[PDB]
Amino acid sequence: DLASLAIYSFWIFLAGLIYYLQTENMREGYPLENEDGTPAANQGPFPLPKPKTFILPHGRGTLTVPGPESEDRPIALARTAVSEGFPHAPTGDPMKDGVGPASWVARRDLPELDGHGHNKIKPMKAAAGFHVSAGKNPIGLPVRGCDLEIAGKVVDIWVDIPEQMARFLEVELKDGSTRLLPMQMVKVQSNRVHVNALSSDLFAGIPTIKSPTEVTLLEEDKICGYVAGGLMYAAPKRKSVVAAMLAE
């Protein structure tokens, strides 16, 4: 019978296709390691696939995945039980050390590039032709932390040119320095932008950019690591829902 044969060979196909797909999602993070870094004994029922190579545009080189793992930078974390399956507590400060929810990856310390080879993200001063086209504009607003203290003053929006959107806010601190805040982590209100993740004292510790008119991919990842890290770690300093409206 044709229908019976059709459904039979379908499941043979779907088994080969789940096999294919899952080996393909083993191209990063695998082989599995034990908590100490040596290769783990249970490697899983699927085989790592044969290398794929990506050609990266404008002299960035290539990517051959899977490869030897790109982790190298010291991890400031110590084991909390003799046995496998337990937390690794920060040896220092998680915010500084780049750990836990403040983790960052050693991405290429070069800006993300656009279709033409120019920087994707650029401050809006220098992003020729860009302006705020709709909604409340945050340039100039006081910036507040979760301790409900004024952390800074927005002095420009960092714009993604090819995709035309607000990537970061640039914030002048108490000392006339600047930092970048991820836009999708700030909240633009009418008389203020509220950064919940960071209480004001932690704003200075936001990893800095070395060149003042570009962000590198390593810097972004360090910035976004540290701002998200404040949700668990700046929690002692965060005033609740109650004090936020009391705040007015």
């Binding site: 990506f54 050609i55 793992e69 974390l77 668990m232």
Partner: protein, 281 residues
């Protein structure tokens, strides 16, 4: 057990209930308090499923079925096997589901990401609860809900759907279907576009977002953008499930008849209602 980048994230913290007691991993899986609450409800629900298989007498997947309390039992409790066992498996499934999601909010918190996955998943939980709890209640009995069995629940859908004639005519069911269809089109388009720009014609460099905006603007005249397509995928998905649950909780409560008779409000509408011609003239 660990991925080659995983170690630096297995930091302590982000636990809703229970401190560090339950904050450990079992292989890849994270436990947490709601990990243990999801297992208790999972095992108990499947033990009580094996119990309806025995009280009914089969060990086959296609046949073992578990029924809701019949219409005489209304909304109150019922005897085990005569509907009552389903009632306890339903509580089991509900707490296993709400624990799975709450287990996810812990995982979000340890990782410092948005709460979007638990939130999207609550829509699924609420569509289940519509069919198993909220519409049963409005209609006055637990018997209006589906049975927990691979084929008998398909038999529940045919039978429930044909009590209103051709259920295609349900207007919110049309809206729901549209969202499932547009969602699968979108999924197809999003997967295909990203893979075409990462896996270009062999030899060439990997394409960029720019190219993607350019392929869709060239094809269709519009590009919603690499952020808009994730946003669109979330709203299509949840809109499907919202409207799907809305069309069932509107049925048997706000609407009793044949759903095809509903569209006569558009036709019996005065002014054009009595002109001969067309189909309804």
């Amino acid at each position: 057990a660990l991925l080659s980048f995983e170690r630096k994230y297995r930091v302590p913290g982000g636990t809703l209930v229970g401190g560090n007691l339950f904050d450990f991993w079992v292989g890849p899986f994270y436990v947490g308090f709601f990990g243990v609450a999801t297992f208790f409800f999972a095992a108990l629900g499947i033990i009580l499923i094996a119990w309806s298989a025995v009280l009914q007498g089969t060990w086959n997947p296609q046949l073992i079925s578990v029924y809701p309390p019949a219409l005489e039992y209304g909304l109150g409790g019922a005897p085990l096997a005569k509907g009552g066992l389903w009632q306890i498996i339903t509580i089991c499934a509900t707490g296993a589901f709400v624990s799975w999601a709450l287990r996810e909010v812990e995982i979000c918190r340890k990782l410092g990401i948005g709460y979007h996955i638990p939130f999207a998943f609550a829509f699924a939980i609420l569509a289940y609860l519509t069919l198993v709890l909220f519409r049963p209640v409005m209609m006055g009995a637990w018997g209006y809900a589906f049975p927990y069995g691979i084929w008998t629940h398909l038999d529940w859908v045919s039978n429930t759907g044909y009590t209103y004639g051709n259920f295609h005519y349900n207007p919110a069911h049309m809206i729901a279907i549209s969202f499932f269809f547009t969602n699968a089109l979108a999924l197809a388009l999003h997967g295909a576009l990203v893979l075409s720009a990462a896996n270009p014609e062999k030899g060439k460099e990997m394409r960029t977002p720019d190219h993607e905006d350019t392929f869709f603007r060239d094809l269709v005249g519009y590009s919603i953008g690499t952020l808009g397509i994730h946003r669109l995928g979330l709203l299509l998905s949840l809109s499907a499930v919202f409207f799907s649950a809305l069309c069932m909780i509107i049925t048997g409560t706000i609407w009793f008849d044949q759903w095809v008779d509903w569209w006569q409000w558009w036709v019996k509408l005065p002014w054009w209602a009595n002109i001969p011609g067309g189909i309804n003239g």
